[PDB]
Amino acid sequence: ALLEIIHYPSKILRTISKEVVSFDAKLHQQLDDMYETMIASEGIGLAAIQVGLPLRMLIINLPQEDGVQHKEDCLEIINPKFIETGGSMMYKEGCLSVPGFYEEVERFEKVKIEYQNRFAEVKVLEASELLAVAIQHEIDHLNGVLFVDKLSILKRKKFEKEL
């Protein structure tokens, strides 16, 4: 099913999401609906709070070389924690919850996270470049943080101007 995506400035997006403890059919249904919703809106990442579900889970599916998203490439990241962070880089970001707006954010250039997949299997994943940015952006959502919160002095006013 398609889910409604919640947009700025909804206070729902300020919610701190809760750890998932039951990795069951309902969880899988929600993840499937998140995927359907993300793809229908042409997104590459989605956190559960963006569809109103305050759970610490997010999906990321980056396009391959022909610009196509293959389902087998989708990461389902549940209960993530950072193990390591490194470096710094600027990256131009957007967000399904802030549609039509894009701006550079400073992110770690490399991250290592630990998380669980939909079968509760523990994973460790190292990421750089776009994947690292997507991981940081989506984890920020779980903590009630939007990328526009991270903009500089100069950039928020451009954001408010475009508003």
Q: How far apart are CB 154 and ligand QAP at their closest, in Å? A: 19
- Interface with ligand QAP, residue 95, by CB under 6 A: yes
Smaller CB separation from ligand QAP, 51 or 133:
133
Q: Which of residues 79-138 bind Co ion (CB under 5 A)?
A: 95
Q: Which stretch binds ligand QAP (CB under 6 A): 70-78, 80-88, 115-123, 126-134?
A: 126-134
- Interface with ligand QAP, residue 99, by CB under 6 A: yes
The SS3 call for residue 75 is strand
Give the gyration radius of the chain's Cα atoms. Answer: 15
Which of 5, 13, 44, 113 is close enough to bind ligand QAP by CB under 6 A?
A: 44
Q: Tokens for 128, please give them.
A: 């750089």
